[PDB]
Design a protein around this ligand. Structure first.
Ligand code: NA
Length: 240
């Protein structure tokens, strides 16, 4: 997250860190959203590589003992069948991870609330991106979970020529684009939390930024639109 602020420990309890084994340690690669006690929602592209993955819930600081973490293996990966790793602009950048154990819920560990199917936010709708991604373009991962206020940019504006053009689809949410704040590498797969009728819901799964940089004016961060995938989500969980 470029131009973020450190999140309070209990603001975003559905946020997880998806990590891969890296020698005798684990490295954060992507975000995710706890949606069942044994199911995480993430970006398909976060799991294109043939790695050993684990999920950390109740995680705040990647580099320090928070006293609140639970560490769980990924037992099953279900990627959207239409996902194509060479065509992220096509969409479908969503995957569900079934965890080897059911996590315990507390104030640091909660299910992410999802929008109703079909829900599209009005332009300029208030949202936060959260994650441990780079704090600057070509930068380093955050230690502490960050958040950045990223208002939505509607499909008509986001798919206009000075924004993302044909690259953005109606199956996606755009947010931000102010040249100051954004998603960056390592935020992928994590939530866009948007405030709708008094309640935050996870409307976005972080998918991509410009190749030119994370915080590039009129290249808002693009998210897979959760509300387009409600039946797919339910269908996967119900059969797994
Ligand atoms: Na920690």
């Amino acid at each position: 997250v470029v131009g973020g602020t450190e999140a309070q420990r209990n603001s975003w309890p559905s946020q997880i860190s998806l990590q891969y084994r890296s020698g005798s340690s684990w490295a954060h690669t992507c975000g995710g959203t706890l949606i069942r006690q044994n199911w995480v929602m993430t970006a398909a592209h976060c799991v294109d590589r043939e790695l050993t993955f684990r999920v950390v819930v109740g995680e705040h600081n990647l580099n320090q003992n928070d006293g609140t973490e639970q560490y769980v293996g990924v037992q099953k990966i279900v990627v959207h069948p239409y996902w194509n790793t060479d065509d992220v602009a096509a969409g479908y950048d969503i995957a569900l991870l079934r965890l080897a154990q059911s996590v315990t819920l507390n104030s640091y560990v909660q299910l992410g609330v999802l929008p109703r199917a079909g829900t599209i936010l009005a332009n300029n709708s208030p949202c936060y991106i959260t994650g441990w991604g780079l704090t600057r373009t070509n930068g380093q991962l955050a230690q502490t979970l960050q958040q950045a206020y990223l208002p939505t940019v509607d499909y008509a504006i986001c798919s206009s020529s000075s924004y993302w053009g044909s690259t953005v689809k109606n199956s996606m949410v755009c947010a931000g684009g102010d040249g100051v704040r954004s998603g960056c590498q390592g935020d992928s797969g994590g939530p866009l939390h948007c405030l709708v009728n008094g309640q935050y819901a996870v409307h976005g799964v972080t998918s991509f930024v410009s190749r030119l940089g994370c915080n590039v004016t009129r290249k808002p961060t693009v998210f897979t639109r959760v509300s387009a995938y409600i039946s797919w989500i339910n269908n996967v969980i119900a059969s797994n």
